Amino acid sequence: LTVSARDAPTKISTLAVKVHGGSRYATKDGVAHLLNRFNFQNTNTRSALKLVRESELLGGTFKSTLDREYITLKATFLKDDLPYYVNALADVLYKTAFKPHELTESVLPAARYDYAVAEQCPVKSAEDQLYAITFRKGLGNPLLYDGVERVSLQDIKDFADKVYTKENLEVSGENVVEADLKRFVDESLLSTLPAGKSLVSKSEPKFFLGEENRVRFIGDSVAAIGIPVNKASLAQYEVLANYLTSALSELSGLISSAKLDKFTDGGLFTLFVRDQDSAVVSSNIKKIVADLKKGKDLSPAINYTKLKNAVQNESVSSPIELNFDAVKDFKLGKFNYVAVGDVSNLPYLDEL
Amino acid sequence: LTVSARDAPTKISTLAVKVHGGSRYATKDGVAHLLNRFNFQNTNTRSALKLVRESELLGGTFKSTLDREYITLKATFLKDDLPYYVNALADVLYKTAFKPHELTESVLPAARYDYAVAEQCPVKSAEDQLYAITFRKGLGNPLLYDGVERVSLQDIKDFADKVYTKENLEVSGENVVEADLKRFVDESLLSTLPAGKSLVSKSEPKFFLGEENRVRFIGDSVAAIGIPVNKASLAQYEVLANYLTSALSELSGLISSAKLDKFTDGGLFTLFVRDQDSAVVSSNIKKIVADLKKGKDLSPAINYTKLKNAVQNESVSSPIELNFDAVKDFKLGKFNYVAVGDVSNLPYLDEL
Amino acid sequence: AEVTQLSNGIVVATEHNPAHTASVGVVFGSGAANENPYNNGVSNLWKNIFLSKENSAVAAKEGLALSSNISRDFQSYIVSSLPGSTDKSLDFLNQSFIQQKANLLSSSNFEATKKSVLKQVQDFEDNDHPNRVLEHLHSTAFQNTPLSLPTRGTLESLENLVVADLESFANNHFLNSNAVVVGTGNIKHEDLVNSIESKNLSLQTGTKPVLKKKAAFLGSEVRLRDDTLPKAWISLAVEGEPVNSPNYFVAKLAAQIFGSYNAFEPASRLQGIKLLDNIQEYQLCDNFNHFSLSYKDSGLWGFSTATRNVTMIDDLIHFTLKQWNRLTISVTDTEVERAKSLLKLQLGQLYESGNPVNDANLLGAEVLIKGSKLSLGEAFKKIDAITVKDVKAWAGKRLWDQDIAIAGTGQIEGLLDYMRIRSDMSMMRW
Amino acid sequence: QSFTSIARIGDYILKSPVLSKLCVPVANQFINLAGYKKLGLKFDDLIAEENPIMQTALRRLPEDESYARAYRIIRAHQTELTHHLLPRNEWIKAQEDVPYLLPYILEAEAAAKEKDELDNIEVSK
Amino acid sequence: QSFTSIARIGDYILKSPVLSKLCVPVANQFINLAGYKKLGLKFDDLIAEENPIMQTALRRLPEDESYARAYRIIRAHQTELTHHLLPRNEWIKAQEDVPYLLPYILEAEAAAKEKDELDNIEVSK
Amino acid sequence: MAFRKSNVYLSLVNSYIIDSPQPSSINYWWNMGSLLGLCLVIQIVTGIFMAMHYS
Amino acid sequence: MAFRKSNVYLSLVNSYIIDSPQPSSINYWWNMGSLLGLCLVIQIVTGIFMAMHYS
C-alpha cells in the first residue's frame, strides 16, 4: 500500500497501480496474461462501456500492461480529475465481474491477438526461450496465454484474489498532489481490499547455465544469449549493454539488441543477433562470443551508460548507480544459447 | 548396383529399388522429402496419368516411401508383367521431367499434407526432436519438408542427380526370378545411369549424450528418451525394446511405444510416455528412468525378442542374431530427453 | 497353392508355405452375430482376457505371440511361434482352453480386463468415426437381427457382464462341432494333425450350439449428427451378397470399379474412374472407399466417405449414385477389365501376405462355412470369366431401384432426406 | 480451333521453302495491318482466355511474364478508351511480338488430348 | 414488448400479497390451457429469436442448455407434424418449466438500453 | 456440382421449388400459397382465350 | 454495409445499374441495349394508352 507521488505545474497526470501479478507469480501458464486482458472489463457497478464513455467526457484513458513481474494499471488524465481515476482503478481491483461471456467475447480474443502478434517476431520467441531455460519455473514462465494448459474462468478469479491484495500492490501517482492521493487512496475501495501476503522474495531464484534450445521458425533467423546476474553484479551488465549498443563498440553493428532486464532480486542480460540469412547471423554471433571471451572494457561507456539510464528513469525506481565510476572490466563466463529460425544452418553451443 | 531375388509359386510379385537418399543425406532441409513426393510424376516418355492408367489395366501399383536412410521405390504387380515394372522404375530415375508446374500443383501440396498430418502426432514430433539432438546433423536431419529454408526446383533436381546413381542404389526383387531380373535390369536405363560414389560411411558418427529439448504443444503431452547404440551393442537394445513391449515387463503399461531404429552405422533407441494429462506422463517417466537405472533383464525376453524379430525380418536383411543367448544384461547409462506438450508441468532431465 | 483339411474327432485345416514363423490357433464358428442385445460384447471380452497380461507373459517366456480376432460370423484365438516350436503352441492353446478355463476368469484379472475394454470401447465411440459409422451402418441395415450386433459390443451391455456370462457363452459356443483349429506359416500338415491327435479326449463333444433367426436387410437410416466434429463421415449401402454366393466375385468386382480414393495423394486422383471427374472439380470429399462386405447370412455393398465440403454433400451422393446407375445400363468393357486387374491385385495382396496370422484368419473363416479354402488361382479363373453382361444382371437385382442403408456422423445437415437419396437409385426412362 | 491444329498447318508451311517464301510475307503484312502492336500488345495477349486450357496456361505462366501481360492489357484498354494509339516508340516491335504463352497452351492441349484418349481406350483380348 | 417491462409488471404483481393470490392461479390455468408442455417444450423455447437481443442471449446460453433446447424443439416439430402429443410422462413438468433464457435476455436488454442512453447523453456546462 | 444447381435459369427453379428448405411441421394452411399461384394462372389463361372473342 | 446493398429489392438494382463492373473500354455500340429497353417501354406505354380507344 505504498503511496508515492511527485506533482508539478503541468496539466496531464498519470496514476499507476503496480501489482505483483506478472508472469512470474503466474499460477497457470498465462493466467497473468488473461487477468491483464481482463482488467477494465465489467465491474459490479460500472460496465466497460460506461467507464470508457464517461472517462472520455472527462479527458482520460486507461491501460493494463503486463510485465514479466507486474500487472500495471496506468490511467492518464487531466490532473484536476484525480478522485474519479482513483475510485475507478480501485473499483476494478475490488469488483470486476468476470462474466463467463466477457472471457469468450472479449478476453480470449484480445489474448489470442496479443499472442499471434508476438508469435511472429522471433526476437520475442528467442527471449521467451531465454527466460525459460535460465530460470525454469520462476521467471521462466510463459509471458502470454497460448492454451498449452487450459485456464478456466475460475483460475483467473483465483489468481485475481491471490494478486489483488493490499500487501502486494503499490500505488504511484506521477504529477499528482501526494496529500490528495493518499486521502483519496484511503476512503476508497483500495483500503477495503484484503491484505494477503506479498509475493516478493529477496533471494536469488536459481540460475542454470550452459543450457540451449533450438526453435524452428519460418523467416528471419536469430541467434541470442542470456546471462543471469546477481543483486550487485547487475551494475556492470548494465553498462555492457549500452556499450554494445553504442558507437564505442566495434561490434555494435553485428547485433540487433542488447539489454539488461532489472528485477528486485536479479536480472537477465540479453543479446540478440537478428538478420535474414543464417550465414550472416552465424558469423555475427560467433565473433560476438569470440571477442567477448577475450574480455575487454575500460568502460569509456560510463558517463553515457548513465546518461541512457537517466532518461530511462521516471517510472519511480532507481537502484544501482554508484558502481558507475566503479567497475570497468568485463570477461565472459558462461551463458545460455537459443537459435531461432534456420536451425540446420545455425551454430550450436558446442562451437561458439 | 546390387540385384536380389526370392521367387515362389505366388501370384503377386513386388519390385523394389532402395536408393540411399533418406533424410540422412539431404543437402537442404527437406529435399529428400520433396524428391520422394516427386517420384512417379511426369517423365519425358510417360505422363503421371498414363503410368497409372496403364499399370491399372496391367494390374499393379507404384509407391514411394521415405526412410531416414532410404527412398524406396516399391512396385506391387502380377508376377509375369515383370519387365514393365522394371523399365517403369527405370524411367523414373533417369528421365523424370521435373516440370515447374508439377512442383506447385502436385509435389508441394502432397508434401504439405504429409507434414500437416505429422505435425499433430506428438510422438513423431518427439522422435524427430530426438534424432535432432542425439545425431545432431547426420540422421539429425528433419524427415519432412516445412520450408524453414527454401528449396528450389533445381535443388530437388541437383539432389536427384546425387542419389540416383548406380553405386548408390540397390535393386531388391521380392518373389522374382533371379535370372530374369538381373537380365531385365541390364537392358533397362538402370545400366545407362551415371555411377557416382556411394554415400554410406561404415563408421559411427557423433553421439552427443545428456541432451534435452522442450517443445510447447497443444493436445497430448509426451515425454520421451533416446539412446544411440554401437554397431554391436544394438542387439541387446532390441531385446530391451521388446521386453518393455511385452507382458514380461513390470512397466509395459507405463509406456506408449518402445523401439530401436537400425542402420548400417549404428542406431537409435526410443521409448515414449504419451498421455492426456501431464501428471500421468510425469509419473510414468520419472519411474521408468529410475526403475531402469537400477538395471535388470535375465533374458526371459530372449527366444521372444527373436520371434518378433523373425516376422519383421522379411525385407532382404536378417543381420543381428548371435548376440542374444549371448548378451543378457542391462542398466541405463546416459540418455537424451525431450518433453513435448504441457512442458510446464512435465519433468526436466535434472530430476529423472 | 496347398490348402489341406482333415477331420478326426475335431476338424483341422492347414496351409504351409516355407517362410519365417508359423502360427496355430483355434477359430470358432460363432461370434458377434451369435450374441444378444444384453450380453453383447462378450466375445470382445474373451478376446481381451486371452490377451491379458497374465496369459501374455506365460506365452512370452515360452517364446510365443498371441493374436485374437472378433468378427460377426466367427471368433479366433491364435498363437504365433518359430517353425520348430510348433509344439510349444498347442501346449499353450490347450492349456488356456482346457486347464486355464478356471483360471484367468479369476477376479482381479477379469475386473482389470473389463475396466480396460470398457475404456477401449469408449475411446472408439469418441474417436474412430469412420469405423463407428460403419458399425452403425450394420446396426441399422440389419436392425433387430443377428448381424446388427457391433463386434466390440455396446458400452452398456458391457458393464453388466460378469464372469458367469463369459462362462455361459464359452460352454454354449466354444465347442468341438463349432470349431476349427488352423495352422499356417511353414508348419507341415502331418506335423499338426498328429500333434493334436497325441492327447486324445473330446471336451463337450456331441454338443451343438443354440441356433437362431436368419439375418435380414431393411431400408433404413441412422443419423448421428455432431456439429462439433470438423468433417462429415458417411457410409451408405444396399443388401449385398453372402459368402458362398453365385455373385460373390461379380459383386466384389463392381466395388473395385468405383474403388477407393484419397484426394490428397496425387496418384489417387489420376485413376481411371469416371466418378473422379465429377468429384474433383469442387472437391466433394477428402476420401472414400467402396466395399463388398460378405457374411454367412447376408452382406452390404456400398461405400463409405468423409468430407469437409459440408455444403455440397448432396452432390457427393448425387454423383456417386448416378455412377452406380451405370452398372445396370452403361458399364463399359474397359471399366470391367480394369476392375479385374485391380481386383486380382488387391485380392492377391490379401491372401499373399507375409503374416500367417492374416492367412489363418482367412483359412479359418472360409473352411468354417464352406468347409474348404478356395485357391487364389481358382479365384482369378472366376474373376476373368465375369463379363459386362454379368455385372449388369447383378446390378439389376442388387442395385437398381433398391432400398438402402444410411449412417452418418459429424456435420451431416447437408445430407438430404432418405427419400431423396433413395430416389437416385435409378433414372428416368421412356 | 486448337493451337495443336494451328501449329500443325503453320509449321508445314514454314518448312517447305515454296509455301514459306510465298506466305510469310502475306502473314507479316497481315499482322502489321492488324494493328495490335500499335496498342502495345503481343498476339498472345489477344488469345481469348475464357476456357479451361487457356486458364490452365495463364496460371502456369511465370510470375514476371504475367505481371507484364497484366500491364499490357490495362494499357490497351486505357489507350482504346481514349481513342488514341500509343506513342509510336511504345509499339511492340515485331521482335518482341513473341508467342510467350503458346508453349504452355500446346502442353495443356496435348495433356488434355491424352486424358481424353485414355478415358475411352478400348480393350482387345 | 420488452422482457424488462414484462418482469417489471410481473414482479410487482408477484410481490404484492393481494394481487398475487388473485392472478397466479389464473396464470397457471392459462398456462395449462396453452399446452406447449404437452409438446415437450419449456415456455422460454417459445420466445421468438429473430432479433439481436435473443440472438445475443442464445449465443450466451451454456452448451448443456443449448443442446437440450435443440432437442426439445426438434422433438416438438416431429410431434406436431404427426398430429399427436407426447406420452404424458414426457410432458415438461411444472418445476421444469423454468425461465432459463430469461436472465441472459434481461442482461442483454440492460446492456442495449445503456448503450442507447450513453449514445445520446446531453452535456450541460 | 449438379446442373439443376449450376445453370443460370434452373438454379432459380432449383432454390425455389426443389432444394428449398422447409420446416417439417408446416400444416395444410401453407398450401394456400401455391393455390393462389394456380388461381393467377387460371384467370390469366382463361382471360386471354376469352379476349379473342370479346368486344 | 450500405442499404442499397443489403435491401432485398434495391440490391438487385444496385448490382445491375449501380455497382455493375463494366470494362473501361466499352464504346457507344454498347449503348444499343439500353436503347432497346427504352423502345420496349415506349411501345408498351403508347400501346396501352391507345388500347383505351381501339376496337
Ligand code: HEC
Ligand atoms: C384479357 C385477359 C384477361 C385477364 C388477364 C383477366 N381477365 Fe377477367 N375478364 C376478361 C374478359 C374478356 C372478361 C369478360 C368475359 C367474362 O365475363 O368472363 C373478364 C371478366 C372478369 C370478371 C367478371 C365476372 C363475370 O361476370 O364473368 C371478373 C370478376 C374477372 N374478369 C376477374 C379477373 C381476375 C381477378 C383476374 C386476374 C387475377 C382477371 N380477371 C384477369 C379478360 C381477362
Ligand code: HEC
Ligand atoms: C395480406 C397478406 C398476403 C397476401 C394478400 C398474399 N400473401 Fe402470400 N404470404 C403472406 C405471408 C405473410 C406469408 C408467410 C406466411 C408463413 O409462411 O408463415 C406468405 C407466404 C406465401 C407463400 C408460401 C406458402 C404459404 O402459403 O405459406 C406463397 C407461395 C405465397 N404467399 C403466395 C402468394 C400469392 C401468389 C398471393 C396472391 C396472388 C399472395 N401470396 C398473397 C401474406 C400474403
